[PDB]
Amino acid sequence: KNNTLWTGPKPEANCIIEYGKQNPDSKLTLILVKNGGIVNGYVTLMGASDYVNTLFKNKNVSINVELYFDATGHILPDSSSLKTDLELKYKADFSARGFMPSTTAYPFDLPNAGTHNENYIFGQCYYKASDGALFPLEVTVMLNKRLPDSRTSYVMTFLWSLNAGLAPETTQATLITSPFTFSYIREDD
Amino acid sequence: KNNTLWTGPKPEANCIIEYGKQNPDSKLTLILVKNGGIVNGYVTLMGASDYVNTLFKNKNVSINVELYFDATGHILPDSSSLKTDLELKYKDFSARGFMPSTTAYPFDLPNAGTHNENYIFGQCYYKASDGALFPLEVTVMLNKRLPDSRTSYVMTFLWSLNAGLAPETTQATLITSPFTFSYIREDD
Amino acid sequence: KNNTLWTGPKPEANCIIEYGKQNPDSKLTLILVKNGGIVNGYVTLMGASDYVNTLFKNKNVSINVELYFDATGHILPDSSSLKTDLELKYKADFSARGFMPSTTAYPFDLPNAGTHNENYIFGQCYYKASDGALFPLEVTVMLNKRLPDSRTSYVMTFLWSLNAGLAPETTQATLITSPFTFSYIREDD
């Protein structure tokens, strides 16, 4: 009851990966579930353009998704990679502050006070290549460390890194990052 | 509170690994917990036969567990590796809400298309009798292909050992360390 | 709703790492959330002494945290690494038995019977070095193999291992283990 904030189970292209592109080129599935004092997160990315679906023709690739939220936990679409706000599973006015990363646990760096390296979550997911070969993707989640502007209250970024000895593909193949799950200390409701 | 569908915390031999065997040869612990729009899963396998407990005498091993469910999320024991249906933590009723979403994880349709979004990959470990720790590459396949006309949902597990040397030279209880995963669940 | 037993989102030094030290030298963040028949755990360690914050000047380091609980799931501070009991996020006169690792799933070994290897959870987290290098830490969780004494009912230990070919640091830097998440079969409420 009021505990899931997401993109939907199978969204249409809603995310921009290629710098300078005006329209979505990928499908970001992001699910944030409230579970006690923590949020259980689920993230997957699917390519929806020739650019995104040919990135894995290279053995060294970095994919960035930046999410910026206002004071009531709503996506700022102008600056964020995700161009459509998240919605509640049973949805439409509401405060999604309780789904946000805690500024107590994950603070914002202050000039001359030193960096907050406790704001990163590292893990791994995979890319299953068209030939069936399995490539690991190194994942970095950064919570609130640095703001992009004066309009943002919370930050959640994702980075998928491919660092292989050989390229996964020689042709266009749908980019799919296997589901990556993570948990963080949430802000007060 | 109607949110855990499981095998029990420490089940008796309930799963068949060896092809052609008629009776259980392993103990599958599977816990499926409803948590908002997702299911939080927990899986571990323990060997319960000489065959299963001597598999790790080889450097290359694949262990497959196939689970097939009906329209109300109940195990089809004839076709599944698990020979006993899952049960709620408190005593029927529909387990549809614990099933993998056919929207998020569809079934491949004959012309053009594989749904590679139906795989969850991760890792767990085998602690050998000598104390060496071996990684096991885990693949979970949700839906994607049906075995027959009786099945509505699919959940398969594969544990792969691909080592430079065999973990064992003798029989030792096979134990895969706990593997946790999450998936978008079907409507209640 | 009585479902989170934790240290707090950002605790003060509450843990002892250095053998023979009498006062806390580290900050252990431990969050235990009840979710059906399982507990969803979250653990992070931050150094709070010159000793702990110079451990990564070595390429081979092992960090151990031992937690011993009574029959009602309360920390025994005399023997445990954590020197302050866990508390409920919302609700001190409570029972935390339901947050404990199951003695059915994770039994205690018996003399001459051969060990319970089902009691371990293995995984990985990282240390982000002052120069941005990312070092993996091999994590082992134990749960209930052996009791330290006649006062303990439940056990939960953590081991972070660094086994690098070079040292992450040449100077003092705050030790931070990136968030490690795990799940275990819980005891009855």
Swiss-Prot record, chains A, C:
Q: Name one GO biological process term.
A: cell adhesion
Q: What does this protein do?
A: Forms spikes that protrude from each vertex of the icosahedral capsid. Interacts with host receptor CD46 to provide virion initial attachment to target cell. Fiber proteins are shed during virus entry, when virus is still at the cell surface. Heparan sulfate might also play a role in virus binding.
Q: What else is known?
A: All late proteins expressed from the major late promoter are produced by alternative splicing and alternative polyadenylation of the same gene giving rise to non-overlapping ORFs. A leader sequence is present in the N-terminus of all these mRNAs and is recognized by the viral shutoff protein to provide expression although conventional translation via ribosome scanning from the cap has been shut off in the host cell.
For whether the record's keyword set contains Nucleotide-binding, the answer is no
Q: Which UniProt keywords are present, listed alphabetically?
A: Capsid protein, Host nucleus, Host-virus interaction, Late protein, Repeat, Viral attachment to host adhesion receptor, Viral attachment to host cell, Virion, Virus entry into host cell
Q: Where in the cell is it found?
A: Virion; Host nucleus
The entry's family comment says:
Belongs to the adenoviridae fiber family.
Q: Which residues of the full protein are shown?
A: 129 to 319 of 319
Protein name in the entry? Fiber protein
- GO CC terms for this protein? host cell nucleus; viral capsid
- Subunit structure, interactors included: Homotrimer. Interacts with host receptor CD46. Interacts (via N-terminal tail region) with pentons.
Q: What induces it?
A: Expressed in the late phase of the viral replicative cycle.
**Superkingdom field:** Viruses
Q: What is known of its domains?
A: The tail region anchors the fiber to penton base capsomers, whereas the shaft, built from several repeated motifs, allows the knob to protrude from the virion.
